[PDB]
Amino acid sequence: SDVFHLGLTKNDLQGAQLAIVPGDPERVEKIAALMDKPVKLASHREFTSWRAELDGKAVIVCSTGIGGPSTSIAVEELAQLGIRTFLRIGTTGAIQPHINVGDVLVTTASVRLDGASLHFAPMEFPAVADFACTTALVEAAKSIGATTHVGVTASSDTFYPGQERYDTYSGRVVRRFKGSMEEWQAMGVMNYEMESATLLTMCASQGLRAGMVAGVIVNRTQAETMKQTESHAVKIVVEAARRLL
Amino acid sequence: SDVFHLGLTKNDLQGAQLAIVPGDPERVEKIAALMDKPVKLASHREFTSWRAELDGKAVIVCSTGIGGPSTSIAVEELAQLGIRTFLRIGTTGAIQPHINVGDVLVTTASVRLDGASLHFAPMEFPAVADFACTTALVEAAKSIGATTHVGVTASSDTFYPGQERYDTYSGRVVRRFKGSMEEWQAMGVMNYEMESATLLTMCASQGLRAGMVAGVIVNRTQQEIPNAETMKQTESHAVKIVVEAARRLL
Amino acid sequence: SDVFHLGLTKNDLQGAQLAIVPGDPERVEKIAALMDKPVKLASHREFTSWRAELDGKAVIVCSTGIGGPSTSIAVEELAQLGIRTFLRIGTTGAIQPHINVGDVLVTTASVRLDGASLHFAPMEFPAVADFACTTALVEAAKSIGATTHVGVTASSDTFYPGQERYDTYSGRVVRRFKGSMEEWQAMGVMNYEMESATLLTMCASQGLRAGMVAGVIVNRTQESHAVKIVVEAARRLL
Amino acid sequence: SDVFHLGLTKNDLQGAQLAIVPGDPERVEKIAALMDKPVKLASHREFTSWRAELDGKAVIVCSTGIGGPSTSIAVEELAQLGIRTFLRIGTTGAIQPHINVGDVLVTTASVRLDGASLHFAPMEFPAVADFACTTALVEAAKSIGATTHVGVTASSDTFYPGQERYDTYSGRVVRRFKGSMEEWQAMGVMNYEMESATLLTMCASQGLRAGMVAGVIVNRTQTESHAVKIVVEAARRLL
Amino acid sequence: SDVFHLGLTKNDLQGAQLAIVPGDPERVEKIAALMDKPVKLASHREFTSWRAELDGKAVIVCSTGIGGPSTSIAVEELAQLGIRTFLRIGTTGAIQPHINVGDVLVTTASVRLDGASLHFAPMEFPAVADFACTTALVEAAKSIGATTHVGVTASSDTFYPGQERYDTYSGRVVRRFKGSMEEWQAMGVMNYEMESATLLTMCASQGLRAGMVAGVIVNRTQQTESHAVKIVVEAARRLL
Amino acid sequence: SDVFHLGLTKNDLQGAQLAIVPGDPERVEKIAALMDKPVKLASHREFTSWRAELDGKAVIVCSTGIGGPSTSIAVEELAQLGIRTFLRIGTTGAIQPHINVGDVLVTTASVRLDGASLHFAPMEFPAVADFACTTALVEAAKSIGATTHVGVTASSDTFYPGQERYDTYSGRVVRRFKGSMEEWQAMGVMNYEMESATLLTMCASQGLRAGMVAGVIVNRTQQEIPNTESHAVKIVVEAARRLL
């Protein structure tokens, strides 16, 4: 292994320069399964990787685990091995009334409600997605006839307080986030997630390309259906990947 | 007038919903000259406005002045008048060695080195351009043929210390901005300009679409300053691109 | 031109060392009109400038435009040409119920609700006016005879949310400024304007003298004058 | 399940009120194996929980994963199931020259170089350990003779720049963290790790007890079983 | 005097390495009179220093005055003279309804609502007490058998606004602290005081052991000093 | 006592509306002596207070103690007691090479290197002094003809690291202040003291007038610790005289 965590060597990537990055390790194989010559690479902690092929071009799929701390390790080490483009796929929950379940969200930039993001660039720096990646995702989404929403996402370091959830053990939410969800809505933020601030800030400030697409599987404001939503989101990302080789 | 600063009424707009917002009032007439039937609407303080037609549709060209404070006023009042899409065209100085004078810059998002953006959203929110507006600018640049770069921009509230210039009266740069240019370069920031941060943040956080394109008229890393003033035809280059891009957003 | 924005040469100042810097370029001639040998020098962007003579000494009148960014440029370039004293004259909205429209206000220091001021000094540093400049202004107010108030001013980067105005396109105000006026009010802040924090901060931390006067055009709870005063104050600092 | 992430029910805990929480799921079983009647409970992502007995009382051993965000989901949800005491066991490096491999570290509180911690308390709130938990750890580390160092730890959201590492793809370290390690060293910080700040801040601000022990396995400026022994021994006296 | 503010020299300490630091100069003597050989060393501004002898070892009691600023002068000039262990004894008011008057509070760490701590470490650094010191104070309160609460303390730079008091000349509290007391209570904060944040932070980041004990003399939601004073003199014996 | 810390009653001010407030409690007496009918009121902790008469009007001299936390208490309780104008007299370390020991520095506004001022207004609010008070202090010094410097002051919550003193136990200063003195120096800041920030802030933000003057006892461009004061105090009194 040439990296301290992933358990991969550059040879395992076979000249790959693009990686699709889901959060959950179990979604790796299912993503790879849609490309050619898919094979397992490695699995260590939340990091399970696979390599496939798209138009004879090596492509890799690697899980990033939950959160920016995890994601920063995966991005950094893949970068070291040779990846230059990162496409994040994942399912999310919307905080906007006009964004319905089954909708597809492509993130232009993210609200930095995380911590790892500051380890790469000051807060004034925008956790913005790469343009090519974003156009690849936006175009792959329409080619499938998906109902898309291209905009701002709020990326939190917590699943609960940071997303203003009160159905918790303490029932309290620190001042900073009190009444925060309604403000994000008023500001047009589409959803909440937990890795895009880091992913987007890391890459945008270190010469790497990154983008993110997600399927909406539940809308806060208001089984097998979610099934198809992830199947289409994954479809969207693999097709966007083809354009970015 | 229906707005306190611009001296404009919705009637003046004739249904327009897109505005091209340069920073110099003197440049408004020139942008409008790339379109059909341009008419001067008004001029008060920093805000000079003209109306033109693009593919038979009403379009507004209005100067914002230097800085986000002045820019926030123009944008705000224009939005009250109906405008929903803002395309900013400007000149800039690149901070990257590979970005040559005469090239065109499209901005995906900006480093918020200003204060007005904070009047619309906390620093955590991204000063990102609208997707459609950026798409139009990138596509139009292709139609025109310019050498284009797409990425991050540093929007500074000052023209001197914020862009780490030392050729000043005091000759000093406050701690925060000491060695900051080298940091932005390292982070891949393309250039410095003074209105995008505010523009992008206030539009993205208020359901308005905004774009930003500029012509590099000088390089902070290069020694020789832009070939006379005719080399500053880059201004005319970026201008055509911003106008072509508006076409696709009508 | 010796500066990139103003379009003025050091000789155009004719040895001037003070400047009245109003916000609106269309008001620059009026002010120069109150002194002697008033001559238009140039007009580029939001910076229109005239030179004049007061007490036999050269004086510059230069518009800054709206906001600290535009002001920071005018002040820097004018300082590059030799100006060492800057007297700002503007309009403003009083936020104290006892301050009436038509009254004049002299700022001692401002609340830094801007950003350009951060390009000259950390937020701990005070955006305070120069003593001799404040005094001249207070003095001139007495001579010209006007309802004057001397105190703290809130300097905002925006005219709408930063001054907590709601009749806007979004009609909303970001958390930071939600209920911020009542607060400034309870802290005895007199008014809302948009250039002092930058003007005052950048001069105070760079060995330049600055003063700030303004005529009230509206009370958030209800020119010839403040101009006469700034001209009068200017003669007291030549 | 009663919780959305760990796949558990209050019933599964058997009344347990204390949990040993390592990072790596793989280490979960080895830890429960040192107790009584260890049984697998669940495994979803990096959250694999086991339930054992220590002197007649049920205790849960649950992995958190890497980082505070991951840690924040397990603590919260474990606390919803009834967990009121948390004990983090781990291995770590060290930025002090007087700490050698095999040494044991007991954190009294930590520097907050994370972000999840700020979702529970303002940065001015101390990411302090619970006194009883810290006592139980020191007494336990003393019972086996492990040379212990009790002090402050630097908890970082990143493994690379946050720990001022330049051996990276960019070989760059943002201004905030440039020259920071030496700073932490001068201030006596013992080591770097990535979940303590989140764990300590969210417990100390929500009526939950927390402690953390770690064995030194590497020294930048220059044992796993011991650590584990010490956390179980300590958990023993806090039931 | 080879120490600018305290007017004390290295010999005035007689080898002392531990110091008890109350905030009131009038409390110094009283504390010092609990041990052998009580001697007055000096008294300048808010700083009145006395020397005592505990179990044959020299001990110092030096007032800090009110606030982190004056406390940082005392701690620094005493450390320059050779002090490494600092024990602050104080009187305080709990903000938790389950804490009664006459109770003893031991501080593990402090919410940094002061400004002098930032002069020793960035806000992220924890205003945490020293383990030894803390254990000693805890054991002493037990040996004395007094009610003891061990936890977090909110250390404020002001006595009124920062502790959210409205019965003042202006009657207004700045946004930052508007509603702040409720927050602290829900977070488990035991009380308010005005020196621990600076003390604890400037000690933990410079290699100096520090502990903090205090007796409850008032409760916002509604023998003590002796108990507090005895515990700290007892605690010092263990840290000797 | 009407207040919790000063041990005074509204009656003890005898109608006083102005209070000269020094830092050292052992200096309140030297200041009261310079006036008519001085009388000692109380001495609790760091707050020793005296009363005097200036031009037939009562005046209070009350020590504030070191730092804004101690000062805020003094100002707050004295204000509660009826004081409305505060003239602070202190000592200070000049950071400019041209300022001489004994020179009198009148402060127009201070850099908030404290923390208590944040308890009254956000950092964006200026720690500025009252125009009348500053005017009186400036003129009174002129009346005497003492070397005077009017300008900005740097007010911190510490005497050592905050004013960038390296000659200490650790010999280091946190990043926040490394190379800070040179900054303030380049920005024209005249000196370092420790209470004006909180004072000027809490007063300017609560409708209380406040002035600030100090005597130079060391020049930081030459040394960290030292080895005319009468002038500074003569000024704060003459100044007070014009504010009654």
Ligand SMILES: O=c1ccn([C@@H]2O[C@H](COP(=O)(O)O)[C@@H](O)[C@H]2O)c(=O)[nH]1
């Ligand atoms: O309810 C309380 C308890 C304590 N303190 C502060 O904590 C100090 C602790 O007492 P001492 O040691 O300074 O006398 C008090 O003087 C005071 O500054 C308060 O402000 N409020």
